[PDB]
Design a protein around this ligand. Structure first.
Ligand SMILES: Nc1ncnc2c1ncn2[C@@H]1O[C@H](COP(=O)(O)OP(=O)(O)NP(=O)(O)O)[C@@H](O)[C@H]1O
Length: 266
């Protein structure tokens, strides 16, 4: 299971917490809980950051593996996040439609495993979908995760732009994950971030209504940085997105349904 690390080995593996981007010769990614550095341990490139029983019960090919702690050490995901690859950050090639279908499938297989096992992720978003050497989807960051039995909470957590209305009111339910996934699927289709302040609309989930009021087609929104995207499977994916984004929790499909529809799309 989990290798217990001393801090001093971690320090030195990360070239003494070299905070420089790896693209410039360093070891640095960073989020709202810590900084993630590339490590070289024996010959195992790892990812080191600053729940564990969740990672201890939940192993799956579409979930990042926790290796160890001092704290947290992870299998290291070469290709970064889905958000950064959708953005083409640091000049990476745009993701093909074929590849985007596989990633959506893998991410749904990942969340399915979590729901079967009665967990609620609570922060499903494209930044929390990592990609290994082979671009296999790895759901990450189970710091907010909760075991399930719908309850409420005074400590509302998540990322605003991906959050279900009931998740923003303080309810806790896997149903919110489904909603967040629907926003991820929209990100995959259009290659647009869930929120852009200098955009209209600022919130990607708002395109559902532009489309429903047939003011726009999903075709207008399709990421133009692809040449392998057929109308039929794009609409098939959008349809699944739309269902996940039903503003009423009990109307959304469950993850088993989302999964079978994404497999049928392919
Ligand atoms: N296991 C990993 N392998 C490779 N990169 C990782 C791994 N875990 C995290 N990262 C990267 O480390 C950075 C920090 O991630 P994280 O601390 O989870 O913040 P975030 O998901 O971007 N936002 P939040 O989860 O709200 O704090 C991100 O840039 C990730 O791309």
């Amino acid at each position: 299971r989990f290798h217990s690390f001393s801090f001093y080995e971690l320090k030195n593996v990360t070239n003494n917490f070299d905070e420089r981007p790896i693209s410039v010769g360093g070891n640095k990614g960073e989020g709202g809980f810590g900084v993630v550095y590339k490590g070289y341990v024996n010959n195992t490139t790892v990812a080191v950051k600053k729940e564990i029983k969740v990672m201890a019960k939940c192993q799956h090919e579409n979930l990042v593996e926790l290796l160890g702690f001092s704290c947290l050490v992870y299998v290291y995901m070469p290709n970064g996040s889905l958000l950064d690859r959708l953005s083409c950050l640091d000049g990476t090639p745009p993701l093909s439609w074929h590849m985007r279908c596989k990633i959506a499938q893998g991410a749904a297989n990942g969340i399915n495993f979590l729901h079967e096992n009665h967990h609620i992720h609570r922060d499903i978003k494209s930044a929390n979908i990592l990609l290994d050497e082979a671009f296999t989807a790895k759901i990450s960051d189970f710091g907010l995760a909760r075991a399930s039995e719908t309850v409420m909470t005074s400590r509302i957590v998540g990322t605003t732009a991906y959050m279900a209305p009931e998740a923003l009111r303080g309810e806790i339910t896997p149903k919110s994950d489904i909603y967040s996934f629907g926003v991820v699927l929209l990100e995959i289709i259009t290659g647009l971030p869930a929120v852009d302040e200098h955009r209209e609309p600022q919130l990607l989930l708002d395109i559902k209504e532009e489309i429903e009021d047939e003011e726009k087609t999903i075709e207008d929104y399709i990421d133009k940085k692809m040449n392998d995207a057929d109308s039929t499977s794009v609409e098939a994916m959008y349809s699944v997105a739309s269902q996940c984004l039903h503003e009423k929790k009990n109307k959304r499909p469950d993850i088993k349904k989302v999964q079978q529809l994404l497999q049928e799309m392919t």
